[PDB]
């Protein structure tokens, strides 16, 4: 489905490109809205921030695959480069539907200590995901234990 939709959006883009030059216009960023997140490569790559340098990036796929021989820790996404391909998936809807599957925020929080916190609303439930004692300690002189 990605390949068929890619053939479609890129043929439409090719047609709009020729008309854009016939009108001696530039294609507007939102003249391609709706197609932005489609195609292989993504249409959005046409407006990649560093495209003026990435135009020189050649052999990037084999380079990324050969990283396995020179680096101990490699990305499991060896096959795609977001600079050249764009974002090839979007899993944001999964979190929404898993919350619904679990019975909503209400049902989820019934399993937690939330009621005992006396916290006003579930909306203010901002977990401090960037600080804590263990974060202050990881830099210090510490034994393996």
């Amino acid at each position: 489905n990605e390949f068929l939709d890619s053939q479609r959006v890129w043929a439409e883009y090719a047609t709009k490109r020729q008309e854009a030059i016939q009108q001696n216009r530039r294609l507007a960023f939102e003249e391609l809205e709706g197609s932005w997140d489609r195609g292989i490569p993504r249409i959005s790559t046409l407006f990649q921030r560093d495209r003026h340098t990435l135009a020189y990036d050649r052999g990037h796929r084999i380079r990324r695959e050969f990283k396995q021989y020179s680096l101990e820790r490699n990305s499991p996404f060896w096959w795609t480069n977001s600079h050249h391909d764009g974002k090839l998936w979007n899993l944001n809807a999964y979190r929404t539907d898993v919350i619904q599957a679990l019975g909503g925020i209400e049902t989820i929080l019934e399993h937690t200590l939330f009621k005992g916190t006396g916290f006003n609303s579930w909306e203010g439930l901002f977990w401090e995901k960037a600080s804590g004692f263990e974060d202050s300690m990881q830099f210090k002189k510490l034994t393996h234990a």
């Binding site: 944001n92 809807a93 979190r95 929404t96 539907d97 919350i99 619904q100 909306e123």
Partner: peptide, 14 residues
């Protein structure tokens, strides 16, 4: 701020 996956509403509501 509330994350997008919370703010967005499943199609069946709207």
């Amino acid at each position: 701020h509330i994350p997008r996956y919370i703010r967005n509403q499943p199609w069946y509501y709207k």
